[PDB]
Ligand binder design. Structure first.
Ligand SMILES: Cc1cccnc1N
Ligand SMILES: Cc1cccnc1N
Length: 165
């Protein structure tokens, strides 16, 4: 009934940086929320722990969740390789929005992005399913290791992750 909360403990070239928590909008996009939740606990036998934010563009977004290819070409959902666009009820309203990366209609896997600006042109194209709850300062710290083309100057990893409460 209460939207679940997940955390990522972030590291920068293996050094602890801090924790980012997310609210997942299970109330609005249950299927998409449950995928991310489960990938964050690792309870299906695979998931985000030890993966990296392979593409970070300051003033746009931090993208991750490619635990099979490590570069934006991989990843898989708890439902199969890909799953449908659940709905587009929620919009890309500003920094902190958590949304699904994809490669076309109905191609959600595990890759996601955290917005660091309003990205309204993505509305109706990417499924928004959560928001940063605590540690937007850590996201901003992460964002500083990105670049215009998205290549990071240090390796930004999810050293640990899971579900809070
Ligand atoms: C999007 C999707 C869902 C289930 C099976 N195949 C697919 N491509
Ligand atoms: C396979 C893939 C590539 C880029 C974004 N999402 C995906 N599921």
């Amino acid at each position: 009934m209460v939207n679940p909360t997940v955390f990522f403990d972030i590291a920068v070239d293996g050094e602890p940086l801090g924790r980012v928590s997310f609210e997942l909008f299970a109330d609005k996009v249950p299927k998409t929320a449950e995928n991310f939740r489960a990938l964050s606990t690792g309870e299906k036998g695979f998931g985000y722990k030890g993966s990296c934010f392979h593409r970070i563009i300051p003033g746009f977004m931090c993208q991750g969740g490619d635990f099979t290819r490590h570069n934006g070409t991989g990843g898989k959902s708890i439902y199969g390789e890909k799953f449908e666009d659940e709905n587009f009820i929620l919009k890309h309203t500003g920094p902190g929005i958590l949304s699904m990366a994809n490669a076309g209609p109905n191609t959600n896997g595990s890759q996601f992005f955290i917005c660091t600006a309003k990205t309204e042109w993505l509305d109706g194209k990417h499924v928004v399913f959560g928001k940063v709850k605590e540690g937007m300062n850590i996201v901003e710290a992460m964002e500083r290791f990105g670049s215009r083309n998205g290549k990071t100057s240090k390796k930004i990893t999810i050293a640990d992750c899971g579900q809070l409460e």
